[PDB]
Amino acid sequence: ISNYINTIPVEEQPEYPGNLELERRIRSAIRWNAIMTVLRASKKDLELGGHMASFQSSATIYDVCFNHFFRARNEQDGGDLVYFQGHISPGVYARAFLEGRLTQEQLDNFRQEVHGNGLSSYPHPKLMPEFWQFPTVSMGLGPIGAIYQAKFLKYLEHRGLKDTSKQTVYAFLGDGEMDEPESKGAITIATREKLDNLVFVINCNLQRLDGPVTGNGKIINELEGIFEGAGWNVIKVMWGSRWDELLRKDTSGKLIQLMNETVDGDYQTFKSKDGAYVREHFFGKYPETAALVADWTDEQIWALNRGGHDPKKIYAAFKKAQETKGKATVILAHTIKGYGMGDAAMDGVRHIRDRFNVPVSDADIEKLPYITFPEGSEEHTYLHAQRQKLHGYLPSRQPNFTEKLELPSLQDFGALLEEQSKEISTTIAFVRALNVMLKNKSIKDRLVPIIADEARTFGMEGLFRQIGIYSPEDEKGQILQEGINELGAGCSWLAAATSYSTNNLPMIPFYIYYSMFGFQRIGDLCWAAGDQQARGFLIGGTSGRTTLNGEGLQHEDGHSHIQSLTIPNCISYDPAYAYEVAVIMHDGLERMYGEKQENVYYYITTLNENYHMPAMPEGAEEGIRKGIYKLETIEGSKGKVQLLGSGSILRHVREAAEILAKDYGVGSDVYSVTSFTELARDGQDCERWNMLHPLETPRVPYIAQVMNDAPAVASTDYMKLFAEQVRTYVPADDYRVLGTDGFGRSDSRENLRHHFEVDASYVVVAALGELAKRGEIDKKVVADAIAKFNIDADKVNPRLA
Amino acid sequence: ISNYINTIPVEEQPEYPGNLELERRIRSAIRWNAIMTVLRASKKDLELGGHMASFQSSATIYDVCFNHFFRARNEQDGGDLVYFQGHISPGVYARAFLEGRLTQEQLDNFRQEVHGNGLSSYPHPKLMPEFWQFPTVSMGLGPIGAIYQAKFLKYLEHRGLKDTSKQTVYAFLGDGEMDEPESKGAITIATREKLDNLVFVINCNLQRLDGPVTGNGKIINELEGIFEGAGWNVIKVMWGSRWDELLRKDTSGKLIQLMNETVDGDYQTFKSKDGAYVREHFFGKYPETAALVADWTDEQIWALNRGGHDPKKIYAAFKKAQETKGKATVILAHTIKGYGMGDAAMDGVRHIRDRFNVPVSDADIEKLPYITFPEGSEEHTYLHAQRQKLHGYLPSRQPNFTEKLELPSLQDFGALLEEQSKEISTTIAFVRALNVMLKNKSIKDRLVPIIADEARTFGMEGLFRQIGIYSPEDEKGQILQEGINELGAGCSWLAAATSYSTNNLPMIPFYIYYSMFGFQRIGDLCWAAGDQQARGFLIGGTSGRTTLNGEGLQHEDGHSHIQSLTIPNCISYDPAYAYEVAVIMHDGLERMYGEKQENVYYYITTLNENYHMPAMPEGAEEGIRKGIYKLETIEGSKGKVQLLGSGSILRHVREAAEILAKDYGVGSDVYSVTSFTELARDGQDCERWNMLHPLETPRVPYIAQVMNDAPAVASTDYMKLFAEQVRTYVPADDYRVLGTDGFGRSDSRENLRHHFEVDASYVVVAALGELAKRGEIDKKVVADAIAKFNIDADKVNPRLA
Numbered sequence A, B: 001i002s003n004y005i006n007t008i009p010v011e012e013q014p015e016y017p018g019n020l021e022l023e024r025r026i027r028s029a030i031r032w033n034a035i036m037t038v039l040r041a042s043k044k045d046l047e048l049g050g051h052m053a054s055f056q057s058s059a060t061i062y063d064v065c066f067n068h069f070f071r072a073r074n075e076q077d078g079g080d081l082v083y084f085q086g087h088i089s090p091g092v093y094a095r096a097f098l099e100g101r102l103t104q105e106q107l108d109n110f111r112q113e114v115h116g117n118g119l120s121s122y123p124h125p126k127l128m129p130e131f132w133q134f135p136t137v138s139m140g141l142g143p144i145g146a147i148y149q150a151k152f153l154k155y156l157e158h159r160g161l162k163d164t165s166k167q168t169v170y171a172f173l174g175d176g177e178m179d180e181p182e183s184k185g186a187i188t189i190a191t192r193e194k195l196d197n198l199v200f201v202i203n204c205n206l207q208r209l210d211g212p213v214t215g216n217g218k219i220i221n222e223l224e225g226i227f228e229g230a231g232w233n234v235i236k237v238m239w240g241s242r243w244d245e246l247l248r249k250d251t252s253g254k255l256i257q258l259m260n261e262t263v264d265g266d267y268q269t270f271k272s273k274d275g276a277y278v279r280e281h282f283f284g285k286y287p288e289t290a291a292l293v294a295d296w297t298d299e300q301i302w303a304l305n306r307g308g309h310d311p312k313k314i315y316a317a318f319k320k321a322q323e324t325k326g327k328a329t330v331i332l333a334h335t336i337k338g339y340g341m342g343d344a345a346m347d348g349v350r351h352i353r354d355r356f357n358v359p360v361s362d363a364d365i366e367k368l369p370y371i372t373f374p375e376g377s378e379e380h381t382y383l384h385a386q387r388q389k390l391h392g393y394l395p396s397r398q399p400n401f402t403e404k405l406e407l408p409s410l411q412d413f414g415a416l417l418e419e420q421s422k423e424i425s426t427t428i429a430f431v432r433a434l435n436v437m438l439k440n441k442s443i444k445d446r447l448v449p450i451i452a453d454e455a456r457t458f459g460m461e462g463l464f465r466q467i468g469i470y471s472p473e474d475e476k477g478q479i480l481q482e483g484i485n486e487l488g489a490g491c492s493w494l495a496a497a498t499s500y501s502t503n504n505l506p507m508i509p510f511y512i513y514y515s516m517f518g519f520q521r522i523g524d525l526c527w528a529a530g531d532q533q534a535r536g537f538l539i540g541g542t543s544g545r546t547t548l549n550g551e552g553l554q555h556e557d558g559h560s561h562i563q564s565l566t567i568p569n570c571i572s573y574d575p576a577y578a579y580e581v582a583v584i585m586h587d588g589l590e591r592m593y594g595e596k597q598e599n600v601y602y603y604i605t606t607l608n609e610n611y612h613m614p615a616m617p618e619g620a621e622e623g624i625r626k627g628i629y630k631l632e633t634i635e636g637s638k639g640k641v642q643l644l645g646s647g648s649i650l651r652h653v654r655e656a657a658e659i660l661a662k663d664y665g666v667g668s669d670v671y672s673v674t675s676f677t678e679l680a681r682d683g684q685d686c687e688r689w690n691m692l693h694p695l696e697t698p699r700v701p702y703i704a705q706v707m708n709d710a711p712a713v714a715s716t717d718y719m720k721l722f723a724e725q726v727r728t729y730v731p732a733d734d735y736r737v738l739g740t741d742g743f744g745r746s747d748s749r750e751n752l753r754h755h756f757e758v759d760a761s762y763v764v765v766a767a768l769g770e771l772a773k774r775g776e777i778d779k780k781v782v783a784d785a786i787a788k789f790n791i792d793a794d795k796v797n798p799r800l801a
């Protein structure tokens, strides 16, 4: 930790290249429009919300960047990737409006998007696909997302895929936000990877929402200490130009002592007093310091500002940041929250108008008018000139990539569609599918396999010799090894999954990890990924409650699909066979990176259990994609039922079908459900449409088109709701669901499948139970089956176990 | 960073108090039993799994702690809270066995616990309620959990609730694990809070699972750098005693230079070589370093050891941490991953026994026999004597608290059961309920309100003056303000929610935050909380997709209940009225902290929208707890339907009921469903039981004891699945569910409820459609309704919008 003063002394401060007076005129108009937008919204009295205080404290920081640093998307690259702090969006909108990129009607529709011509509260690409790029409002995700975005850009350059050398990633953060574990939890990574293309800009106004970050301390010093300790280049922008003479004249060095010893709480109090209170309680602490401003008027003392408000001090920091190599830079900008709002936190409106000399007359002020700069005016000319010299305007977004990829055909995965000689798993199938992709000339180098330390567990080792591990193991390595860091891996996956838009360079990531540590552990990022229109694959390996049998409670995943189904644009599958994996992966590739360019990403749970992999039935392709297809029909004269299974449990439902036929003469239709969720969604869509078109013939859910009315039983390696979600659409009077509800525990797969009541014996008992209630068989038959199969009818419900 | 040598010089380390030779014998026996336990498991060939290399590298560290530091639960306090590293559990089981706390049958049942007498793969209290205490296998959670556990102990002392001054929180971490953002993301909090009762013990074997943490770097230096920068006291245990002489004689300082410059990857290569190799490649780097061991034999050089394997160096480090005040201490213990096993890292284990001089011939090794010390032996006596001096054995756990609390009665919440004077929200109802509890003499001071910065947003600011904010706003403050850190707040919540077990001091936490940032953002901790038997309340504020209307995409929660239902012991409610909030909170209090002491925690979504709060219907209490009750029946001669709603949408479902009656003559039964999830679980439990007892009287789902067979419509502020989950149990042929599927966006509540097709008009159209289907009304009536209500039947599905 250094002294509580600017890192860059004035004698090392470069000359400011812009027109300070003109830029201030433009900046005031932006401040005004940002405030007008939020105020007009509040007048509606519709609890729309919107902030003003934050942007007022960081406006000048962004202004200097827009005028002298921010590089817009261009022919060579996607320009600088700016992770704008979420709630300062009104300021971004105000500037875009001034630049003529947004209309007054859009500003007037701030926070009213449903009808189409509005603006999102925060940066949401999904809602404004041509404007916003990075979802930052969920605090903490922006800083780590930015770290890996910068790492990914280095990756593209090192891989020889794209020269991203002129791109800088800017993460605009709040000091309170730095408390989120993900904000500083991965900063050492920037040092390990020498991310000199990453700049953290922490707005240090010393306050969070309901108070100071650390009133009894100094968060700027806390931030400096840990970032410095993490190997980052720390640049503190503490005081404005007005303090320079005072510091120079301070021979006793007592002023510096005073600045260092004062805590955030005290500074904040001076922040709400007056020049007299300052010279009295601040400078008046020591005669050396008190004498420094003795010949100063209370108004000249109150004029002393914080560095984050001085364009000159700001410029120096960003210039130094862009020159620095070998490590990432973090700029700690000292600002005043709610700057220039005085009474804040119609007289208030008049105050800001006067405060920033806004060109609005008393006659118009009541109209809460937006300010514009006429073409030909000095402001208009300068505003556009600076941007033009920096390649255009930002933020802006390209929804689709331009190049045409020559994707592998399903036939290219032919081997996976055939019966397998050796017993393998769906994870082995996944790896083989990847290998097929690594042979496709058009996308082989666009593939981005990602692992979180463990590769052997998922049989990814074979890939190492083929494409290697990115380790700028060398700079050309293709696989991203992020270590024990699922969130970090997810962020690399996200950067890769959205490269098609950000860099107009489609990259196809495949991140495989323990399924449990997916949505459950990085769920907020997965939701943000949907918002960011990510197109890639998330592979939940070692999935299924009973399948990762020895690991127990915190590893056995029987619910990730319940978490994944909450994301609108995530398509989830739980294949049982190798050929399904192939079909699903091929379809995903085509949908996301083929002509369609569908904005959706995939989640495929794979297994670590080997078993016989049969050949794909002819014509089953569509059913596999849709989510269900009839595997086969087993004859039986004493009864008829339908059996459904997915994942590792399907082969057990198949065993039950054979038992039912052989021991009870009960026939059955056996279905492989590759996706209960896609089926549920299709069903909901049909019912929704039917409800809205009462005069039309009811549409039929696909699952209802595949199934019949015979009593049905479904068993999965997931909690019952996973299969129960399609109940409404199953055309059968009876539909019993077996599932793995309850906490996992360590044991053999056989013991766990009996414990969770999902194995063959339970499926059989469930099936016989339905046939009994229909009179087709006597109840003693099921009671005898229960005894026969060593089933404990009175063991505690697994959910409670 | 400091030089790559021990922090504590030899002339500064205290005399080792233990019997080195005796301790090694005991340690070797533990090492043996641990290996045997895992080997016998693998023999079964049931893919049970289990690790050995990790415990081998940290075995000595734990041994010194068990012999001289770890305080077991005692009459005065819960003892030291040790977050044992998850996968080294075999070593803990081995010691427990040697202490006579576990039987041979239990060790032989390692990772096979379904039938009872077995052992969990890792620390899982839910599975082993009297043994394990803190779930640490999901890496990254243990370090944050520990930080907040330490802070909570400070809190209990400062609040005058319990003298926890004699307790120390030890977090045993892996170095690879430190890459998880959660691992270092909150370490500055330990400094802010001067957590000198917290000790992080990082096993620095330099390797994660598939490779080194940072092969071309120095992970220990990285760790020292950021922790030191965060204000922690860092103690490096680098080299064993054999190095002291070498370091002392080297007047050139070259050995230190050599140690500093050598990277992790090279040190690891040495480990796989021999004395000659080290002599040449390490000491041979410089003539001065070569000269230090010139008179040494290669064997002597090979004997040079890493500090983390030397009891004297380890002891010195833990003793110094014990003396350090003002902040937390991190011990960086340098170890060898595949320590003993070496070449390994059934008979090949003789190499293990040879190097650790294990008493067992190569004739009985194939038998993989366990080693035990008979009562009276020098080892047995020493083993127990050291533990007795430290108050007993650990880990151990107390499932229930001993004191009886005098909980408030429901009548104490009487004011909340009456009609409210003004329109309020369920969040205001929640705060008023908390106030009732704060008046109860028995639990007032055991309550732990927790917020993450935002308090005013949840109307919590009023409590700030009554009970204050914990700030050691003073050391007596009752409210925990954890800032913008949901994971941290969750960890404080967890520490409080499990104090009843850990300190035999029940504390009742109420953590309120933006519902979206609950399970979605800290879901892995919520799962771990269930495993830890947490008993507390999670309050998801500003919940419901359409209710937090202006916030948009990353704030509008219409799915947290879908995530919460995946946790077996989490009880979730989505109340619409203030009286329901009261009944639910009182019941939760009674269930968790009353005589029942049920191991479950509560999740209650509350709202930021005010509306009329009617009085509770007489006798509706149990129905509220169970999940559903009939509000009223409206007469109608043209038809009859059932209408269900929860949360903020219920009042709109009631509006629909009035419309149907007044405009279409359609009568209805209106139900408030306080918990679709509890109703779903009840139904699942009933059918499970029924199918398991085919000859007995079938149990009827609770929801089927409330609803009838008339066509039904349900609508909530959550995705359709939230209400569709009870389909199988709804005793009606038609059950249409409306929901908020799709990403949120900014607008008025009215526009969002129409966009998400959940408002009164959609409920009406849904109900009429059902009637039209059964010919009770003309299809034209439904079509006409759609037109009248300005419903766009061809609007894109909200899920895809």
Ligand SMILES: Cc1ncc(C[n+]2csc(CCOP(=O)(O)OP(=O)(O)O)c2C)c(N)n1
Pocket: A054, A087, A137, A138, A139, A140, A173, A174, A175, A176, A177, A178, A203, A205, A207, A208, A209, A337, B452, B453, B454, B484, B514, B517
């Ligand atoms: C994960 C998450 N939690 C909580 C919030 C709610 N929130 C909005 S503004 C705010 C405080 C902002 O403080 P800081 O990060 O210091 O930024 P400032 O506005 O002062 O620039 C909070 C907690 C959020 N957006 N995301």
Ligand SMILES: Cc1ncc(C[n+]2csc(CCOP(=O)(O)OP(=O)(O)O)c2C)c(N)n1
Pocket: A452, A453, A454, A484, A486, A514, A517, B054, B087, B137, B138, B139, B140, B173, B174, B175, B176, B177, B178, B203, B205, B207, B208, B209, B337
């Ligand atoms: C969140 C999470 N991700 C992955 C794993 C799988 N895992 C088990 S052991 C291991 C490596 C452990 O390395 P380290 O933390 O360095 O400890 P060591 O075993 O070397 O002492 C991993 C990644 C886990 N337990 N938790």
Ligand SMILES: [Mg+2]
Pocket: A174, A175, A176, A203, A204, A205, A206, A207, A208
């Ligand atoms: Mg701030």
Ligand SMILES: [Mg+2]
Pocket: B174, B175, B176, B203, B204, B205, B206, B207, B208
């Ligand atoms: Mg390690």
